[PDB]
Copies of this chain bind each other. A is one copy, B any other.
Amino acid sequence: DRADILYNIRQTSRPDVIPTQRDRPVAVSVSLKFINILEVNEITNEVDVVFWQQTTWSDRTLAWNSSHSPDQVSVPISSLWVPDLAAYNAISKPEVLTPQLARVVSDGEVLYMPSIRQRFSCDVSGVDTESGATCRIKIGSWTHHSREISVDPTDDSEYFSQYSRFEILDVTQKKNSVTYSCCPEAYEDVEVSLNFRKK
């Protein structure tokens, strides 16, 4: 049934179409687990970090009966709709470090969690402070407003490399909504706050 399931997903799902249920927004969960902090610059206020970007959402049309079938499959993301998330204050392309496969569950829920390396512009002052710096990253949909996509956040140092020259103090995630000057609509995002200190 596993090739069957991939087949059913590809015949049934269009990657270029938002899986909106009954003209409700598509609820996406976003969550970052930091793995490393590689380059910090206090003169230019730029940081280099590696993290797992956990992204989950639902496409109920994908679902299948798993009484005698596998409960899950791994699928190339090029066969799915994936939300067009962006980090607003990113100053580089995000470098994907892991195979780009999503996990689909028989109920129609999807998990995509690449490990990503990326550079951001953010407040770095206090890095050499026992209070540490707090760097804020904002992530949301680039071209879908809140009527279509809604972004909700789900040991902060649990998988953090210990060989990093930095140490994490806390990670906190909060939901925001913003309307920009060019356009009438609002865009939901998550601000992740990364509190870290040099060692």
Chain A residues within 8 Å of B, Cβ to Cβ: 2-3, 6, 14, 16-18, 20, 23, 33, 36, 38-39, 43-46, 50, 54, 70, 74-76, 79, 84-86, 88-93, 95-99, 101-103, 111, 113, 115, 117, 121-124, 142-144, 148, 155, 158-159, 161-165, 180-183
| Contact present for A99 and B143 (CB under 8 Å) | yes
Q: Per DSSP, are chain A's interface residues mostly helix, strand or loop, or mixed?
A: loop
- Residue of chain B at shortest CB distance from A4: B17
- Residue of chain B at shortest CB distance from A149: B74
Question: Hey, which chain B residues are within 8 Å of A101, CB to CB?
Answer: 84, 142-143
A33 to B183, CA, bound (A): 13
Min CB distance A179 to B, Å, is 12
Beyond known contacts A45-B164, A50-B91: 6 more, CB 8 A cutoff = A33-B181, A50-B121, A92-B117, A99-B143, A121-B164, A155-B181
